[PDB]
Design an enzyme around this catalytic site. Structure first.
Site, PDB file in Angstrom:
ATOM      1  N   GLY A  47       0.818  -1.198   0.000  1.00 17.37           N
ATOM      2  CA  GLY A  47       0.000   0.000   0.000  1.00 17.37           C
ATOM      3  C   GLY A  47       0.853   1.248   0.000  1.00 17.37           C
ATOM      4  N   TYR A  49       1.473   3.054   2.517  1.00 13.90           N
ATOM      5  CA  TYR A  49       2.154   3.185   3.800  1.00 13.90           C
ATOM      6  C   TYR A  49       2.694   1.870   4.345  1.00 13.90           C
ATOM      7  CZ  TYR A  49      -0.475   7.550   3.612  1.00 13.90           C
ATOM      8  OH  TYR A  49      -1.019   8.753   3.216  1.00 13.90           O
ATOM      9  N   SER A  50       2.684   0.790   3.560  1.00 10.29           N
ATOM     10  CA  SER A  50       3.077  -0.504   4.108  1.00 10.29           C
ATOM     11  C   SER A  50       3.378  -1.499   2.995  1.00 10.29           C
ATOM     12  CB  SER A  50       1.988  -1.068   5.019  1.00 10.29           C
ATOM     13  OG  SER A  50       0.830  -1.434   4.288  1.00 10.29           O
ATOM     14  N   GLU A  51       4.097  -2.559   3.375  1.00 12.18           N
ATOM     15  CA  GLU A  51       4.273  -3.772   2.580  1.00 12.18           C
ATOM     16  C   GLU A  51       3.758  -4.951   3.401  1.00 12.18           C
ATOM     17  OE1 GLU A  51       8.181  -3.892   0.458  1.00 12.18           O
ATOM     18  OE2 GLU A  51       8.598  -2.259   1.891  1.00 12.18           O
ATOM     19  N   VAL A  52       3.053  -5.895   2.770  1.00 20.43           N
ATOM     20  CA  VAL A  52       2.306  -6.908   3.514  1.00 20.43           C
ATOM     21  C   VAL A  52       2.853  -8.284   3.152  1.00 20.43           C
ATOM     22  CG1 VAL A  52       0.041  -7.834   4.105  1.00 20.43           C
ATOM     23  CG2 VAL A  52       0.281  -5.403   3.467  1.00 20.43           C
ATOM     24  N   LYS A  67       2.695  -6.502   8.496  1.00 21.45           N
ATOM     25  CA  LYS A  67       2.606  -5.263   7.737  1.00 21.45           C
ATOM     26  C   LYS A  67       3.775  -4.375   8.156  1.00 21.45           C
ATOM     27  CE  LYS A  67      -0.794  -1.502   7.185  1.00 21.45           C
ATOM     28  NZ  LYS A  67      -2.180  -1.166   7.626  1.00 21.45           N
ATOM     29  N   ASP A 155     -11.327   5.400   6.192  1.00 18.78           N
ATOM     30  CA  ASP A 155     -10.822   4.958   4.897  1.00 18.78           C
ATOM     31  C   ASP A 155     -11.606   3.750   4.413  1.00 18.78           C
ATOM     32  OD1 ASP A 155      -9.221   5.182   2.598  1.00 18.78           O
ATOM     33  OD2 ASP A 155      -7.521   4.098   3.450  1.00 18.78           O
TER      34      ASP A 155
HETATM   35  C1  LIG Z   1      -4.807  -6.356   0.311  1.00 12.27           C
HETATM   36  C2  LIG Z   1      -3.557  -6.700   1.129  1.00 12.27           C
HETATM   37  C3  LIG Z   1      -2.255  -6.817   0.352  1.00 12.27           C
HETATM   38  N1  LIG Z   1      -3.492  -5.858   2.310  1.00 12.27           N
HETATM   39  C4  LIG Z   1      -3.321  -4.521   2.285  1.00 12.27           C
HETATM   40  C5  LIG Z   1      -3.329  -4.045   3.614  1.00 12.27           C
HETATM   41  C6  LIG Z   1      -3.528  -5.180   4.416  1.00 12.27           C
HETATM   42  C7  LIG Z   1      -3.633  -6.320   3.599  1.00 12.27           C
HETATM   43  C8  LIG Z   1      -3.846  -7.517   4.437  1.00 12.27           C
HETATM   44  C9  LIG Z   1      -4.014  -8.903   4.212  1.00 12.27           C
HETATM   45 BR1  LIG Z   1      -3.886  -9.610   2.421  1.00 12.27          BR
HETATM   46  C10 LIG Z   1      -4.195  -9.762   5.279  1.00 12.27           C
HETATM   47 BR2  LIG Z   1      -4.460 -11.625   4.962  1.00 12.27          BR
HETATM   48  C11 LIG Z   1      -4.210  -9.270   6.583  1.00 12.27           C
HETATM   49 BR3  LIG Z   1      -4.490 -10.487   8.076  1.00 12.27          BR
HETATM   50  C12 LIG Z   1      -4.044  -7.937   6.815  1.00 12.27           C
HETATM   51 BR4  LIG Z   1      -4.000  -7.288   8.582  1.00 12.27          BR
HETATM   52  C13 LIG Z   1      -3.865  -7.073   5.765  1.00 12.27           C
HETATM   53  C14 LIG Z   1      -3.667  -5.582   5.825  1.00 12.27           C
HETATM   54  O1  LIG Z   1      -3.624  -4.873   6.780  1.00 12.27           O
HETATM   55  C15 LIG Z   1      -3.183  -2.581   3.944  1.00 12.27           C
HETATM   56  O2  LIG Z   1      -3.227  -2.248   5.085  1.00 12.27           O
HETATM   57  C16 LIG Z   1      -3.065  -1.586   2.857  1.00 12.27           C
HETATM   58  C17 LIG Z   1      -2.477  -2.144   1.578  1.00 12.27           C
HETATM   59  C18 LIG Z   1      -3.110  -3.471   1.107  1.00 12.27           C
END
Ligand SMILES: CC(C)n1c2c(c3c1-c1c(Br)c(Br)c(Br)c(Br)c1C3=O)C(=O)CCC2
EC number: 2.7.11.1
Length: 333
Positions: A47, A49-52, A67, A155
């Site tokens: 995103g 602000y983050s990488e997941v 995250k 959001d």
């Molecule tokens: C769509 C995915 C890649 N994703 C995103 C976020 C978050 C995830 C995600 C997943 Br998948 C999973 Br499973 C869990 Br558990 C959790 Br917590 C999260 C989470 O917080 C963002 O915060 C913003 C950017 C996109």
């Protein structure tokens, strides 16, 4: 004499009645975990602000999600952590398990319990009528809960909803913009994504509340029942409000602006011009016919109101006829 003040219709004083430590996130001392407990397995997405990542807790060999946050002010990290801790255990809210810092770079990362990597935005344009109702109701459960705990998500949008469709489970994610509601507090209007911003953000009215989330939810509902993604497709911030006005009409917009004595920019007024309200039924086609009912249009009309104080609360929404059978089916499952 400046904008008229505003208060939330429900859950107004929820944070006042709690101890100060509940909402005073600046005073909270974060207790960081051990990053060595977690090993990253693979990437799930990213995103602004983050990488997941998918990850493993090696102390219990449990699957988790990590995250990793991009650089932001310590104040905002503490806010997000306090909100997530306060909502832990709520219906359809993501569950924070730990908070860690990299041993070398000190970069902070949030650790969550695992859920299925299926984004609502990948599914919500192909839903049956009843599935739209069902998943809307599950989002409402999350929003009523977090509002009842004194928190605005700020959001709400399809990308911040995760679906485990096999188990018909749903989670509201991405609490990085969330804030505690306090009556009389003025809030930043640089929240939500453009297509989901409420009119209060677009006219720079700062004394907003939980009802911001209800506008965002209406934008999701419209997109699903008319198969138009997004429903209000603004190309910049002023155009987002122009597009809203071309649907809701300018009469109720100017009445809203007058009600709170909002001072619009002189030629923003000229930009808005005059537009009649369109009937909701005008966005129905042969393709989305089976998704539009009288109750859906009445429900949508009661979410997408300029006046934030006039929009349905999350509980009022959950009691709307649009969910009647949904509610009866939730009692038997
Ligand atoms: C769509 C995915 C890649 N994703 C995103 C976020 C978050 C995830 C995600 C997943 Br998948 C999973 Br499973 C869990 Br558990 C959790 Br917590 C999260 C989470 O917080 C963002 O915060 C913003 C950017 C996109």
């Amino acid at each position: 004499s400046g904008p008229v003040p505003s208060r939330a219709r429900v859950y107004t004083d929820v944070n006042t009645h709690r101890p100060r430590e509940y909402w005073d996130y600046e005073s909270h001392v974060v207790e960081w975990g051990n990053q060595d407990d977690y090993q990253l397995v693979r990437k799930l997405g990213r995103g602004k602000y983050s990488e997941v990542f998918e990850a493993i807790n090696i102390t219990n060999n449990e699957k988790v999600v990590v995250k990793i946050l991009k650089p932001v002010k310590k104040k905002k990290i503490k806010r997000e952590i306090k909100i997530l801790e306060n909502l832990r255990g709520g219906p359809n809210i993501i569950t924070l398990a730990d908070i860690v810092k990299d041993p070398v770079s000190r970069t902070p990362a949030l650790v969550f319990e695992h859920v299925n990597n299926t984004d609502f935005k990948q599914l919500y344009q192909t839903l049956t009528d009843y599935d739209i109702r069902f998943y809307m109701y599950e989002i409402l459960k999350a929003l009523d809960y977090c509002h009842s705990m004194g928190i605005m998500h700020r959001d709400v949008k399809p990308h911040n909803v995760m679906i485990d469709h096999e188990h018909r489970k749903l989670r509201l994610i991405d609490w990085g913009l969330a804030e505690f509601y306090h009556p009389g507090q003025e809030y930043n209007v640089r929240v939500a994504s453009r297509y989901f911003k409420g009119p209060e953000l677009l006219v720079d009215y700062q004394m907003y509340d939980y009802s911001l989330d209800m506008w965002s939810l209406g934008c999701m509902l419209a997109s699903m029942i008319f198969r138009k993604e997004p429903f209000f497709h603004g190309h910049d911030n002023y155009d987002q409000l122009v597009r809203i006005a071309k649907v809701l009409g300018t009469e109720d917009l100017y009445d809203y602006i007058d009600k709170y004595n909002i001072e619009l920019d002189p030629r923003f007024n000229d930009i808005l011009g005059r537009h009649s309200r369109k009937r909701w039924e005008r966005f129905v086609h042969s393709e989305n016919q089976h998704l539009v009912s009288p109750e859906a249009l009445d429900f949508l009309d009661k979410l997408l109101r300029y006046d934030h104080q006039s929009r349905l609360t999350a509980r009022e929404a959950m009691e709307h006829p649009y969910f009647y059978t949904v509610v009866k089916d939730q009692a038997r499952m």
